[PDB]
Ligand binder design. Structure first.
Ligand SMILES: Cc1nc(-c2nc3cc(Cl)ccc3[nH]2)c(C)c(-c2ccccc2)c1[C@H](OC(C)(C)C)C(=O)O
Ligand SMILES: Cc1nc(-c2nc3cc(Cl)ccc3[nH]2)c(C)c(-c2ccccc2)c1[C@H](OC(C)(C)C)C(=O)O
Lengths: 141, 141
């Protein structure tokens, strides 16, 4: 599968919102607790993500997530396209959160601990952290 | 230079705080506008950074930044060490911000645009985004 493809979705936990980006070819996650599910937050998160990785196209399970001109502007500026055709790893991330949730006071901290655990964990075999970097390097030179 | 080494500092701009992490071997930046320069923010940012990259040791230009047990806990949990001996790229990032600052309403958005521009820009020669991934892949298998 193509190396510039990400998937972006929100989950709710403790009445708060978690934005979850999955790098599809690799399983690597970035995530962030946002105070509300707005186009503002999604636009911002997209700019952050695009500064960090080569992001060509973004899929979602909720297309209306992407309809605001606020979001369309971010994609425009960073040069991102939306999907043309078409786990959950939200599941196990949500498993890992509940697991570490005692280890921290705020949800946001548990989230980051869970992203840490998820991206490092060897599946086998490489880790999602190792696979992303390999995929993206393999695809450069 | 060693691939797990990052440098973390804050700058102030428009009475707000920008936390800037530089991957030293590569020049790659992650950055974030934080509302105040606390141990809470730095601890959190460190957890985020460590979930994303292999982070062994972190340097700073302001050692007191790292003295809180709040920060020491984050490093403890993620397995990070502080420095044992020892651009600014804060300079040009601050150049890029002023450059794009019209292109956006908030500082935080200008920051991310500037991180995007900085990480992509080919120096020559690869980009900081390409060098980080190469360095980290080169160092794996
Ligand atoms: C609020 C908070 N306060 C403290 C904390 N720092 C302390 C310093 C002292 Cl002296 C006493 C008690 C203290 N408790 C700590 C040590 C953490 C922390 C927990 C796990 C890993 C890293 C840091 C958090 C943490 O929140 C962040 C800072 C990461 C945003 C959380 O959600 O649990
Ligand atoms: C506050 C804000 N509002 C709008 C905006 N969205 C609109 C939608 C409509 Cl219908 C009309 C005017 C609009 N203005 C936009 C389009 C942006 C934006 C600017 C550059 C790139 C991506 C998005 C921002 C932006 O803030 C973030 C959303 C990125 C946090 C900023 O700081 O300039």
């Amino acid at each position: 599968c193509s190396p510039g493809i990400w998937q972006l979705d929100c989950t709710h936990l403790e009445g708060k919102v978690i934005l979850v980006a999955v790098h599809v070819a690799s399983g690597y996650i970035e995530a962030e607790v946002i105070p509300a599910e707005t186009g503002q937050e999604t636009a911002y998160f997209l700019l952050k993500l695009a500064g960090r990785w080569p992001v060509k196209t973004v899929h979602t399970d909720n297309g209306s997530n992407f309809t605001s001109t606020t979001v369309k502007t971010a994609c425009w500026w960073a040069g991102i396209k939306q999907e043309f055709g078409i786990e959950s790893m939200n599941k196990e991330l949500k498993k890992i959160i509940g697991q570490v949730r005692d280890q921290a006071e705020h949800l946001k901290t548990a989230v980051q601990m869970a992203v840490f655990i998820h991206n490092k964990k060897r599946k086998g075999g490489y880790s999602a952290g190792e696979r992303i970097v390999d995929i993206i390097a393999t695809d450069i030179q």
